[PDB]
Amino acid sequence: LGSMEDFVRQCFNPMIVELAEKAMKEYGEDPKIETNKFAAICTHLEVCFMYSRFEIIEGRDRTMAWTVVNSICNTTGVEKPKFLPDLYDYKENRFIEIGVTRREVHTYYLEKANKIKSEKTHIHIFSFTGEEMATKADYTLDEESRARIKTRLFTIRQEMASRGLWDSFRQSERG
Ligand SMILES: [Mn+2]
Ligand SMILES: [Mn+2]
């Protein structure tokens, strides 16, 4: 049984580890203790950066994110989201909320949708199974582009498994 804080650090992007290290410290969660959530954050992030037409919101400091949201919201006449999407899509002129779950796709979706009280925020969910779900059957990206996202979650799962780490990860998610 390996060290997740190891695997995370030596299996994600430096960039990605330290944006998520830094995302965590901001809620006073230690990456050394909260290592399963540490990886999850890194993965969720990695995905958002592969779904990139698209402006990125996840990853920025909250000050920077909220300003980013606002110039768009001021320039397009788009409703302000209450919370913070992950991306914006210039082609469909909408904000997108990205979700990566190790649970039920349907459960995670409705949890997302009911949080954000979206009218216009689009919601794309993937899991480590292929299983996915986008708001209104609107998959935004082309079967290929989504497929590469699918492949890599798979390459995350087994590489965890190689170290006895997959098992726990799998079962430790909540809402
Ligand atoms: Mn986000
Ligand atoms: Mn998200």
mmCIF file of all heavy atoms in Angstrom, residues 44 58 86 97-99 112, ligand 2:
data_model
loop_
_atom_site.group_PDB
_atom_site.id
_atom_site.type_symbol
_atom_site.label_atom_id
_atom_site.label_comp_id
_atom_site.label_asym_id
_atom_site.label_seq_id
_atom_site.Cartn_x
_atom_site.Cartn_y
_atom_site.Cartn_z
ATOM 1 N N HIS A 44 -9.681 16.359 -11.007
ATOM 2 C CA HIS A 44 -10.764 17.286 -11.467
ATOM 3 C C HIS A 44 -10.250 18.479 -12.230
ATOM 4 O O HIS A 44 -10.864 18.963 -13.170
ATOM 5 C CB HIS A 44 -11.602 17.806 -10.328
ATOM 6 C CG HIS A 44 -12.464 18.959 -10.723
ATOM 7 N ND1 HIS A 44 -12.042 20.271 -10.623
ATOM 8 C CD2 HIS A 44 -13.724 18.998 -11.223
ATOM 9 C CE1 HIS A 44 -13.010 21.066 -11.039
ATOM 10 N NE2 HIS A 44 -14.040 20.323 -11.403
ATOM 11 N N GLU A 58 -11.368 27.554 -13.141
ATOM 12 C CA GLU A 58 -10.849 26.722 -12.093
ATOM 13 C C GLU A 58 -9.354 26.930 -12.157
ATOM 14 O O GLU A 58 -8.843 27.259 -13.215
ATOM 15 C CB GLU A 58 -11.256 25.281 -12.325
ATOM 16 C CG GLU A 58 -11.013 24.319 -11.151
ATOM 17 C CD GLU A 58 -11.693 24.738 -9.867
ATOM 18 O OE1 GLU A 58 -11.085 25.559 -9.141
ATOM 19 O OE2 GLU A 58 -12.801 24.241 -9.554
ATOM 20 N N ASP A 86 -16.492 26.224 -14.020
ATOM 21 C CA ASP A 86 -15.111 25.820 -14.251
ATOM 22 C C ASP A 86 -14.649 26.532 -15.517
ATOM 23 O O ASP A 86 -13.522 27.033 -15.599
ATOM 24 C CB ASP A 86 -14.945 24.272 -14.320
ATOM 25 C CG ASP A 86 -15.254 23.554 -12.988
ATOM 26 O OD1 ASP A 86 -14.847 24.024 -11.906
ATOM 27 O OD2 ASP A 86 -15.921 22.502 -12.996
ATOM 28 N N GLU A 97 -20.065 23.938 -15.745
ATOM 29 C CA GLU A 97 -19.641 23.305 -14.466
ATOM 30 C C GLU A 97 -19.194 21.826 -14.591
ATOM 31 O O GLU A 97 -20.017 20.930 -14.827
ATOM 32 C CB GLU A 97 -20.727 23.417 -13.396
ATOM 33 C CG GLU A 97 -20.325 22.738 -12.068
ATOM 34 C CD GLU A 97 -18.879 23.016 -11.676
ATOM 35 O OE1 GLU A 97 -18.565 24.178 -11.335
ATOM 36 O OE2 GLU A 97 -18.073 22.068 -11.735
ATOM 37 N N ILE A 98 -17.899 21.577 -14.416
ATOM 38 C CA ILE A 98 -17.354 20.236 -14.672
ATOM 39 C C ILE A 98 -17.276 19.411 -13.382
ATOM 40 O O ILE A 98 -16.987 19.949 -12.313
ATOM 41 C CB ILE A 98 -16.016 20.230 -15.465
ATOM 42 C CG1 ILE A 98 -16.083 21.200 -16.651
ATOM 43 C CG2 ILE A 98 -15.733 18.845 -15.964
ATOM 44 C CD1 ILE A 98 -16.216 20.545 -18.054
ATOM 45 N N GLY A 99 -17.622 18.127 -13.513
ATOM 46 C CA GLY A 99 -17.748 17.188 -12.413
ATOM 47 C C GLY A 99 -17.084 15.887 -12.847
ATOM 48 O O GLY A 99 -17.232 15.424 -13.985
ATOM 49 N N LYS A 112 -25.079 18.560 -8.559
ATOM 50 C CA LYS A 112 -24.471 19.737 -9.173
ATOM 51 C C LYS A 112 -25.519 20.735 -9.623
ATOM 52 O O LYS A 112 -25.546 21.845 -9.143
ATOM 53 C CB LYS A 112 -23.563 19.343 -10.328
ATOM 54 C CG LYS A 112 -22.636 20.469 -10.756
ATOM 55 C CD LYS A 112 -21.558 20.802 -9.672
ATOM 56 C CE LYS A 112 -20.392 19.843 -9.676
ATOM 57 N NZ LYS A 112 -19.277 20.501 -9.024
HETATM 58 MN MN MN B 2 -16.141 21.375 -11.036
#
